Design a protein around this ligand. Sequence first.
Ligand SMILES: [K+]
Ligand SMILES: [K+]
Length: 394
Amino acid sequence: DIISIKDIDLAKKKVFIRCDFNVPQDDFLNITDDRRIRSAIPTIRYCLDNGCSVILASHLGRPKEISSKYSLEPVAKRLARLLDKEIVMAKDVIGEDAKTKAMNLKAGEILLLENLRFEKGETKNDENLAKELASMVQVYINDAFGVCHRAHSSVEAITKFFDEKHKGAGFLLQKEIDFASNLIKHPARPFVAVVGGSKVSGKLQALTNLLPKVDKLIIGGGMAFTFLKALGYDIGNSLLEEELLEEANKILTKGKNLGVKIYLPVDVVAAPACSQDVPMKFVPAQEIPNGWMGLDIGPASVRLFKEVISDAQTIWWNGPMGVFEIDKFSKGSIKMSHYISEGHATSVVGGGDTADVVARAGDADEMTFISTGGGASLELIEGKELPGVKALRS
Ligand SMILES: [K+]
Ligand SMILES: [K+]
């Protein structure tokens, strides 16, 4: 149903590619993870190989207003090394400099527009922005699954300025869609969802839609403590969403009614504060000391979870098992990455935090697929129609 880049005649044309270059940066604005730039390359190279000129556009962060801090200039440098091709940068998005550069662009050249979100209309699906972006090119390609869950100009309104023979989905967008969709369709079984992170409300809708689909569900991260609390466990000073206690109980009740095997941590790494520099204890989940907090799954839980996933043919994992940015509270996530990656399941990772764990674990290459689109994969797993994808439906 979705129009593919493969069914569009784009040879020798001028092509707008909406890419996802929303990469992490450090305080000196050096790029600390270029995976999204790398994932964009096959679509870009396919156009260049077909004699196109290429206008690339992406957002970076969420600028409130224009500043050098959110410039795409470091993305341009990094992409130039990775493609071994030179890049022209526009000083603006649809101002005079972009339009002139776009018009001057020769076959085989690459133009990177400045941050899309320097235009206030982008996150409002402004139709004038869309029209101005569209005027620069003959073909529209979306390769940015990561923003497709939002009605933004560069993925939604812009598509109204191209007919079905001049717009389509890039190779990355198609993969993101195929991997996410499989999971809510007919995945190989046993199908295990492994869910984590610190908030239940983050995952509630995904869990509700996955529940009738999965064979087993492991719940870790800070969000587990709301489930344990919903079951009457004392959780000391751990994270709690009081207001979601009843919803968590509903997940467990329906899970059981549907025959889903649901596992929560049976032990945790507990500490008096969330820092490297305080003491830590391995304790049962029923015995977090007064005033202490659970910050990672414990070794018994790691081991149980290993056994839970051991016969899996499909695993979806979104969310760390614990506060993995702190070394002392990272081991449960790291070992889960090891166990998931080393097993024989089709393994699909979601969430930037989870991609980060998998990177630190050194396992990125043994995962079947790591989504580089944060909330977008989740909203698909939730059962929603994504406006960016809909926009490209034949
Ligand atoms: K046009
Ligand atoms: K594997």
